[PDB]
Write a protein that binds this ligand. Structure first.
Ligand SMILES: O=P(O)(O)OC[C@H]1O[C@H](O)[C@H](O)[C@@H](O)[C@@H]1O
Ligand SMILES: [Mg+2]
Length: 448
C-alpha cells in the first residue's frame, strides 16, 4: 500500500505508527532532492513530539547537504513568512494543527513559501520515502538557530495605522496552542487591553485540543467576552493559521462574513485590487468586493489553488469561509494574526461594533453554515440531489464540486480534500425561511 500519513495537502498521522523520527528523517532527505538551491526553514508547534520530529527532519536535511534555519516554536505562518523573507529554498512546519495530542504532522513549502501538495511534490516525497532503505548519512551542513521574530512582528504591524487604533478590550484565546506568544510580543506596540484565555502553550491540552469550532471550546471565548464587556474575542487553532471571531455579545461570527469584511478593509488601502474567494459561499463576498471598488475572483477551495490564483492575478487578498485569510504582502500566505489586527483597526476607525459591521450582511445573505455528510454512496447522493432540482434549471458551475444557482438561493456541494466527507453550503437572498427549507430538503436527499 502507501503511507497513510501523506494527505492531499500535508503530512498528518498518529505518532509513532503513522509518523515517527525515522520517517521524519527520510522526509528531510527526500525534501532536499525536491527543492531548488538554498537553506531550509524549520519550525514546530506546541505538541510534545514536535521538537523530536523537527530534529529528525533537520538531521535528514543536513545529511543531504542542506543548511537548516531553525526558527523554533512558532506558528505555521511564521514558517511561511521566514521561508520567503530569508529567501530559503523551502520550509517545513511540524504541526498537527487541531488533531488530538497523539497526532502530529508536517506542512511543506518550497521557494516563496509555495505549497508542496500531493500533485506538486508531496507524493513524490512519499514514494521516495517509501522505497528508501539507505543507511542514514551524517550531516554535511550546519543548523543555525534564528528565533528572532522582529521582522515578522514588524510585518504584522505594518497592516494597521497604529495612530488610529483605539484601546479596545479584546479577548484572546490561544487554546493552549502557540498564538499567545505572538499576542504578547505584539501587545507593547498596541493600545488594546487583552483578556487572555487558555493562554499558556501546553501540548497536553488540558482545556481541550485547539479547535475553536468545538462548541465547548467556542463557549470559553464567548463567556470571556460577555463577562468582561470585551469589544470582541479572537480564538485560534493550535498553529494559529486559522482565526475565529466573537462579537461583543459573545456570538461566534460565521467565517463567510469575515471574507467580505476583510476585503473591504483591505481595498480601502489598496484601491481596485483583485480579491480571491472560494465557491462555497459567494454572493456576499462578490457584492462587498465590488462595492469597495475591487474585483472578485472565483477560485477552487484549498490554499494551494487560492495562492496560485492570487499570484496569477496579483490579488491583494484572498479568503475562504473555512477561516483562512491570505495576503499578497505576506508572501501570498495565510495568517491568523493579520485578520484580527485589520478587524481591530476597522472597529477603531469606524466607531462601529464588530456585530454591527456584519449584521446587515448576515441578514442580506443568510447561510446554512457548512454541513458535513458521511454517506454510503457520495456519488449517488449528489446525483439524487441534482436530479431532484433539475426541473428548476439552476445555473450550474463545476469550479469545486457542484454549485447551483437558482436565483434567490444557491448551494455548493463538494467532496472534502482533507476528510472522506461531502460538504454542503446553502445561502439565500435575504430569506431565512427559504434557507431552512432548502437546506433541510437537500439534507434529506443526501441521507436517502
Ligand atoms: O473543505 P476541505 O476540502 O476539507 O478543506 C478545508 C481546508 O483544509 C485545509 O485547512 C486547507 O489549508 C484549507 O485551504 C481548506 O479550505
Ligand atoms: Mg491550523
Amino acid at each position: 500500500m502507501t503511507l497513510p500519513a501523506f494527505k492531499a495537502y500535508d503530512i498528518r498521522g498518529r505518532v509513532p505508527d503513522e509518523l515517527n523520527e525515522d520517517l521524519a528523517r527520510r522526509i528531510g532527505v527526500a525534501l532536499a532532492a525536491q527543492l531548488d538551491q538554498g537553506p531550509v526553514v524549520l519550525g514546530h508547534d506546541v505538541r510534545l513530539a514536535s521538537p523530536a520530529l523537527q530534529e529528525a527532519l533537520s538531521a535528514g536535511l543536513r545529511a543531504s547537504g542542506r543548511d537548516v534555519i531553525d526558527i523554533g516554536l512558532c506558528g505555521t505562518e511564521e514558517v511561511y513568512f521566514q521561508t520567503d523573507y530569508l529567501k530559503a529554498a523551502g520550509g517545513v512546519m511540524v504541526t498537527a494543527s487541531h488533531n488530538p495530542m497523539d497526532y502530529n504532522g508536517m506542512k511543506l513549502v518550497r521557494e516563496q513559501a509555495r505549497p508542496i501538495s500531493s500533485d506538486t511534490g508531496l507524493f513524490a516525497i512519499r514514494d521516495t520515502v517509501a522505497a528508501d532503505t539507505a543507511a542514514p548519512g551524517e550531516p554535511t551542513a550546519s543548523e543555525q538557530s534564528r528565533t528572532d521574530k522582529t521582522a515578522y512582528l514588524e510585518h504584522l504591524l505594518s497592516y494597521v495605522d497604529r495612530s488610529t487604533l483605539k484601546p479596545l478590550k479584546l479577548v484572546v484565546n490561544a487554546g493552549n496552542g502557540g498564538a499567545g506568544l505572538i499576542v504578547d510580543l505584539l501587545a507593547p506596540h498596541l493600545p488594546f487591553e487583552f483578556v487572555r484565555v487558555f493562554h499558556e502553550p501546553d501540548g497536553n491540552f488540558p482545556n481541550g485540543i485547539p479547535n475553536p469550532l468545538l462548541p465547548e471550546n467556542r463557549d470559553a471565548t464567548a463567556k470571556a467576552v460577555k463577562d468582561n464587556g470585551a469589544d470582541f474575542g479572537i480564538a485560534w487553532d493550535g498553529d494559529f493559521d486559522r482565526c475565529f471571531f466573537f462579537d461583543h455579545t459573545g456570538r461566534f461570527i460565521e467565517g463567510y462574513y469575515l471574507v467580505g469584511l476583510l476585503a473591504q478593509a483591505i481595498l480601502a488601502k489598496q484601491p481596485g485590487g483583485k480579491v480571491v474567494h472560494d465557491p462555497r459561499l459567494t454572493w456576499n463576498t462578490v457584492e462587498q468586493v465590488e462595492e469597495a471598488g475591487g474585483i472578485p475572483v472565483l477560485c477552487k477551495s484549498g490554499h494551494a489553488f487560492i495562492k496560485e490564483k492570487m499570484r496569477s492575478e496579483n490579488a491583494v487578498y484572498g479568503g475562504e469561509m473555512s477561516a483562512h485569510h491570505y495576503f499578497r504582502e505576506f508572501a501570498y500566505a495565510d495568517s491568523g494574526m493579520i485578520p484580527w489586527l485589520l478587524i481591530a483597526e476597522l472597529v477603531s476607525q469606524s466607531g462601529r461594533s464588530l456585530a454591527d459591521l456584519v449584521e446587515a450582511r448576515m441578514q442580506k445573505f443568510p447561510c446554512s453554515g457548512e454541513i458535513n455528510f458521511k454517506v454510503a454512496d457520495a456519488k449517488a447522493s449528489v446525483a439524487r440531489v441534482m436530479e431532484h432540482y433539475a426541473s428548476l434549471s439552476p445555473e450550474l458551475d463545476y469550479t469545486d464540486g457542484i454549485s447551483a444557482d437558482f436565483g434567490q438561493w444557491r448551494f455548493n456541494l463538494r467532496s472534502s480534500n482533507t476528510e472522506p466527507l461531502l460538504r454542503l453550503n446553502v445561502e439565500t437572498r435575504g430569506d431565512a425561511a427559504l434557507l431552512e427549507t432548502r437546506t433541510q430538503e437537500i439534507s434529506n436527499l443526501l441521507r436517502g
